[PDB]
């Protein structure tokens, strides 16, 4: 039962179709990885403040997964016969709460979800500073309470109940949060980072302990029942789309150009050019891959600048021999390509059974590399070696978990020895580490946006710099947080007003979170 | 080079010139409120966007090709007793092509057109429209009297295969058309010319076996460069299918669809159907899914396009199609959700390269006779009501005989003619019924359709401003009543252009009524 509550909360993390709209609408534009689909460009790409769209994480987690995890934790707390499920619940509670606070800032946590259990309504919004304090304390204690000789964890879609891997994940999350606070508090950050490395079970040191939620393959449906079906990855469902021929996932130029201009082996693993005239209405079957034809004919790729739609600017196309040939037996096909020259997200990332990414060994290597550049006491491996290991693991992650074609040693070496190289100054090293992390986090948009904001890399420019300033109703600078749902002023007035007063008296998506020291 | 060959080319060019036919899709079909919703039709004619290049198509095409060549051939065969038949046919076709020019622009070169082969005879004067019409009656009368079936064979005639008696019938029927045209501006001359034509050698077109239809061949539609010099197929039908046929097919205007549907017209679903085009060929109307009966069974409203509307504005109310859901099982690109498919489209029978080039029909002759009888002219012993009824029956049978539409039975015809297709009782009711039925007949003859709407005042059409689209009408609120002269004329035929515009007070505006158009 607590074990069943874990299962459902894991499924809801990427399985909730309503919630996943937030990432397509906002995060993927803010990190300049996708742009051109109507939803992504309209909301995040052009800074449309929309309180209902911004509210999806808040409502989803406080009404469902976070609420239920809190209940289950409470019911198993201080029970020596339930220490493993209780500890696992505490780790997952920290994880879900980290998404909330890294989106909105101060928020209910210590007093959350206690109305039925403790008659405690109107929970205060804990200060982000204090939420992060609690993350380190909860994770450390959970690691120390876990005992493999005790209860079996049975509803775990990440590690199949292996509580030693749960210690590795908890200590890796301590690394992530330590590095998160390293601008505002380098001293505490270094201490937390070093403590985690020394903690029981260690950290995730290779991909065999990557934390990935397992999802199944279910046909993509947008009917009403689909909004209560968490069995499939709903982020992948939306990246395919409710309107998949008009509004697929086109890549942003910032990301496509980072890959292409650096010679990254992942360029045409993450993206392809497809003609979709024969594509299924409900799955990415029967697409025509024109990528190699475009390369052979010298046709320029036209990825979407921040602020651009697939149709604005309208691209320069070409006449496809592949499509002309196909039209002979499939007369609905046209040979004239237009928006097909704009790179799209590859089919490997559009599957109901894509994993729900929580944390990878590649990220741990990048965290270790940055801590080493920062002169923390993290071990005997050079920062450069840790960096190279993180890049290799990030590239292999796509092969292992999405079926992308394997990258040879020669291909990796060619890349790492040219534009993927680590660099020779601290700023170049931190730039390379965090640019590589941004690519790794493509399938983890919550972490991708948090790490862009925290590290300041890549250095992203407003859509105004690309010519789209006339559309920026919600202001010029890329938002650094989302606003609280307006109904909170009705359901939780005092606590909401208190949080807003702490920000200076307004709820503004340009206000930096506590751990975010400056913006870009 | 041979005059008989020049006749063939000029006939083919009349509807075979893919560049020139854009004018009808862009302007005429919107001004007569028969098609609306296709981008081109709504943007230009539906929202009064004046564009001199678009308005110039008839002038440029005819004066550089078909009319020029007809004039050359007429000169080469004139005053030669052994060439009287080809010469007379050329004179009749010359009048026909000239009538389209003057009914579009007003005063225009005629007596002085097409010289230049002579010497420095460039810079022709614009003959006054009133005089052009007088010349039409004289030319047609003389050609009828010079024709002699014992003399030269006419060998390249795609209308009548050289049957010169039928050319007499066409010439005298054109005299009826032009006599009725001038019946508001010069009622006494109109009556005299109408009566003279009925009494002339060869008589008029009295049944469908003498309908004047240019025969076109069944060629595949192509929009490549070579297709702009290929006149073998009906290019108006090609354009009504469209260069962008899935995004911008020919949707019907509500004025015309509602006239048909609300009158119980048997032609309603002969001229129009609702289609889902997800599997339709890119270059032909093959593989469309007819949903019309399904909509009727499910009670889904037809949503034809008001004047000024695009297919996407207003966005219509759709439904979920059982037919399409079934087709999606084996054709997964199909969606079952219909949206703009609820807007009636032009039926496939009107989207064929072998659709005839309509010049003049026996149905029109019956409607002209009926109107002349209401006007108390001396036209014979048939009642106006019977002539009207014969006109409607011929107009309906015209679609069966020439477009492959399902035949209308006597019982179906009688049911319509006895109810909402009835002739009516006051003079205004009779004139409205005659000219509303003529408007339907002239659907496949847009030059005549627009002329007769302007001349008769029926149907009574309202500006797109009355349907809510006034904000978009850059070229004025009233529906245009002529097109302006080409900029090529004001640039390179300036003295003659200046003389013509001086007769309109120095103006050259699409709201200025032509001489035969007494009011709007
Ligand atoms: O002629 C011979 C000659 O030819 C030569 O070739 C020529 C050729 O002939 C010629 O045709 C060609 O011309 C080119 C021309 O074709 C081209 O046209 C372009 C044009 O330039 C573009 O501007 C145009 O762009 C369009 C685009 O197509 C549209 O798709 C787009 O539509 C936008 C919509 O997508 C968008 O819709 C969104 C809704 O607004 C929104 O409300 C909705 O919200 C949903 C949401 O998505 C859901 O996720 C959500 O789900 C909720 C959930 O949130 C909650 O949790 O739960 C609920 C239930 O529980 C659940 O419901 O729901 C909400 C609510 O429903 O999302 C929608 C999207 O999904 O809306 C916006 C705004 O309205 C739309 O904008 O619009 C754009 C424009 O705006 O595209 C056309 C193409 O069609 O132009 C070029 C350049 O001019 C031309 O060149 O030219 C060639 C070459 O010259 C030959 O060369 C020659 O040889 C021959 O001779
Ligand atoms: O999700 C859970 C939930 O879902 C529920 O269902 C939801 C669902 O989720 C959601 O997606 C859906 O959202 C709906 C949304 O989809 C819909 O979107 C609409 C939108 O509202 C519209 O506004 C939009 O309209 C677009 C339209 O699509 C475009 O096509 C159109 O494009 C126009 C162009 O077509 C046009 O192009 C022309 C060029 O401008 C012009 O230059 C060019 O000229 C050519 C010319 O044509 C030639 O003839 C000529 O030929 C020359 C010749 O002249 C010479 O002689 O010779 C030459 C060669 O020799 C020769 O070339 O040449 C020239 C060449 O240029 O012609 C072009 C046309 O062909 O350009 C204009 C202007 O730029 C374009 O406008 O634009 C419009 C917009 O303006 O469409 C989208 C759809 O895509 O919105 C609705 C309503 O908001 C949404 O509802 O909602 C559903 C329902 O809720 C489920 O129900 C639930 O269960 C689930 O839970
Ligand atoms: Mg920052
Ligand atoms: Mg008039
Ligand atoms: Na889903
Ligand atoms: Na043609
Ligand atoms: Na008949």
Numbering used by the authors:
A (entry chain B): 40 to 559
B (entry chain A): 39 to 558
Article excerpt on this structure:
This PUL-encoded system specifically targets mixed-linkage β1,3-1,4-glucans, a group of diet-derived carbohydrates that promote a healthy microbiota and have potential as prebiotics. The BoSGBPMLG-A protein encoded by the BACOVA_2743 gene is a SusD-like protein that plays a key role in the PUL’s specificity and functionality.
Most strikingly, in the complex with barley-9, two protein monomers were found in the asymmetric unit forming a protein-sugar-sugar-protein supramolecular assembly, where the protein interacts with a dimerized carbohydrate consisting of two barley-9 chains related by the 2-fold noncrystallographic axis. The protein-sugar-sugar-protein assembly that constitutes the asymmetric unit of the BoSGBPMLG-A–barley 9 complex may be a consequence of a high local concentration of the oligosaccharide, which might be compensated by the formation of aggregates, helping the crystal nucleation event. The structure of the BoSGBPMLG-A–barley-9 complex showed an ∼41-Å-long binding platform that accommodated and accompanied the natural bends and kinks of this mixed-linkage oligosaccharide. As in the BoSGBPMLG-A structure with the heptasaccharide, the triad of residues formed by Trp77, Trp350, and Trp353 constitutes the center of the platform, interacting with the internal sequence of the gluco-oligosaccharide chain (Glc3-Glc7). In particular, the side chain of Arg378 makes four water-mediated hydrogen bonds that likely contribute to the specificity by stabilizing the Glc4-Glc6 stretch that accommodates the minimum binding motif.
